[PDB]
């Protein structure tokens, strides 16, 4: 009864059935992490909630170069309590791995439980601004996604991408205007952040306002070229 449809990228599917929906093919079947629904069509598929994860919001907002492919290594900064990092582990599958990072402790415990559930997730519960304590653990990621809230966002991204990014690599930022400035217009703040990344050698390619999902949040996709 339900119909599957591939996305513009790999590992992301769209269910056209009684209702249109965005789904991901399970690597682990029959076990839900945060009580999300599922669909079997027979193999298993898991709903991606764009309101509750800032990555699928950029997906439904349309994004050409999303660097997460299946057989790749992705570093997730700000994986709090595990939802979207479970989704990106689900879309990378067994070959690709995901190095999750978090600092706090109750989302840390939830992330540790979910990393006991899933094999591709490898969790770090360290200060995201001190990259050495997982420099001793992580090797040469292919692409970085980051969703933090500390206002030195370009600072921590420059640090982690100088230490871990593959050359010609990919880097995805989520930016919260109401947290970084909260007085000037969000377009001006995002242009200032784009300039900061361009200074710190991220050649940007696009940005995108997550309009119907969050207030004043944007996603910036850029590449890493000829650096270290």
């Amino acid at each position: 009864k339900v119909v599957i449809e591939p996305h513009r990228h790999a590992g992301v599917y769209i269910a056209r059935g009684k209702e249109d929906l965005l789904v991901t093919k399970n690597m682990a079947p029959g076990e839900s992490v945060y009580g999300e629904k599922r669909i079997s069509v027979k193999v298993e598929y898991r709903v991606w909630n764009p309101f509750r994860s800032k990555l699928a919001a950029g997906i439904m907002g349309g994004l050409d170069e999303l660097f997460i492919a299946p057989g790749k290594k992705v570093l997730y900064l700000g994986a709090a309590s595990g939802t979207s990092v479970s989704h990106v582990s689900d879309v990378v599958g067994p070959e690709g791995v995901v190095y999750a990072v978090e600092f706090s402790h109750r989302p840390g415990r939830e992330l540790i439980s979910m990393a006991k559930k899933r094999p591709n997730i490898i969790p770090i519960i360290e200060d995201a601004r001190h990259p050495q304590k997982y420099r001793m653990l992580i090797g040469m990621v292919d692409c970085v996604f980051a969703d933090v809230a500390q206002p030195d966002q370009a600072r921590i991204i420059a640090l982690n991408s100088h230490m871990f990014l593959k050359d010609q690599g990919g880097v995805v930022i989520s930016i919260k205007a109401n947290c970084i400035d909260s007085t000037v217009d969000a377009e001006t703040v995002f242009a200032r952040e784009v300039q900061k990344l361009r200074e710190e050698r991220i050649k940007p390619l696009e940005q995108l306002t997550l309009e119907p999902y969050e207030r004043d949040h944007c996603i910036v996709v850029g590449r890493y070229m000829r650096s270290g």
Binding site: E5, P6, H7, E19, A57, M60, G62, P204, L208, T209
Partner: protein, 93 residues
């Protein structure tokens, strides 16, 4: 007190069911999408079809713009009157 308890129970019933309904629904984004280029000749030369390597409605559609090589509704029953009817039914609910 008993009246207010009854109204409060009804309100929480409807709040939880509205949460689940909006969780199972899906919307379309309407956001600003900028694309950074490096040369103004290319900036004047820009075309979204030529960029994404797609066609007309694929350009104007957001959640899926599959390329021409990715491309290269009879399964659903009465796709001109029924499917949109059920979608609008869920939205109205």
């Amino acid at each position: 007190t008993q009246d207010s308890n009854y109204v409060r129970t009804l309100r929480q019933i409807e709040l939880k069911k509205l949460e689940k309904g909006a969780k199972q629904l899906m919307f379309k984004s309407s956001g600003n999408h900028t694309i950074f280029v490096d040369s103004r000749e290319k900036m004047n030369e820009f075309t979204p079809e030529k960029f994404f390597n797609t066609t007309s409605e694929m350009v104007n559609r957001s959640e899926n713009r599959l390329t021409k090589d990715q491309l290269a509704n009879a399964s659903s029953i009465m796709p001109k009157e029924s499917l949109d009817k059920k979608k609008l039914k869920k939205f109205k609910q």
